[PDB]
Amino acid sequence: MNIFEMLRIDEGLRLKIYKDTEGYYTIGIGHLLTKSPSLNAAKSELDKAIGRNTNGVITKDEAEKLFNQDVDAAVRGILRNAKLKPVYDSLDAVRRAAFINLVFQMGETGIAGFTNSLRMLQQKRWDEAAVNLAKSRWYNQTPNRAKRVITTFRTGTWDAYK
Numbered sequence: 001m002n003i004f005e006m007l008r009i010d011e012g013l014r015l016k017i018y019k020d021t022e023g024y025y026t027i028g029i030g031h032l033l034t035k036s037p038s039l040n041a042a043k044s045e046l047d048k049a050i051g052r053n054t055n056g057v058i059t060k061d062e063a064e065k066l067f068n069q070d071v072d073a074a075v076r077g078i079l080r081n082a083k084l085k086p087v088y089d090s091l092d093a094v095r096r097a098a099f100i101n102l103v104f105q106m107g108e109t110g111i112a113g114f115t116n117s118l119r120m121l122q123q124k125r126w127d128e129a130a131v132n133l134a135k136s137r138w139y140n141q142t143p144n145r146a147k148r149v150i151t152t153f154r155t156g157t158w159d160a161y162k
């Protein structure tokens, strides 16, 4: 198991524009297109991201390409972020994948306040961090995915995902 397979389980793959859990226009492997309500604004962004007139549909290859870009940008953002970087550095390989998942999902941004959880993770207080992470809109909105991520942080293994 690796970050790609992990996120592919969490996000699924859809080749036609769809709405995500928050109601946003998405495509592929969790690739957010726009937060606007307009399906046309979504088709426009999609064509712009693909470099072709897509009519809201892409191929598996095109989906995989967006995915590779997005994981690369997720990692790079973490490494550029002064709050994130030290946590990431401190973690083992599995837990690093858990942190990447969290950022892919919610942006460098929204996780902005796992301030307390982040300090807990850096300190390696696994159980306490898992408890703190669970007190979040994140956990309440997408409880099954949150549980898997949380378990990866607690345990440092891929058990939640076999």
Ligand SMILES: [Cl-]
Residues within 6 Å of the ligand: 049
């Ligand atoms: Cl893009």
Ligand SMILES: [Cl-]
Residues within 6 Å of the ligand: 142, 143, 144, 145, 146
């Ligand atoms: Cl879920």
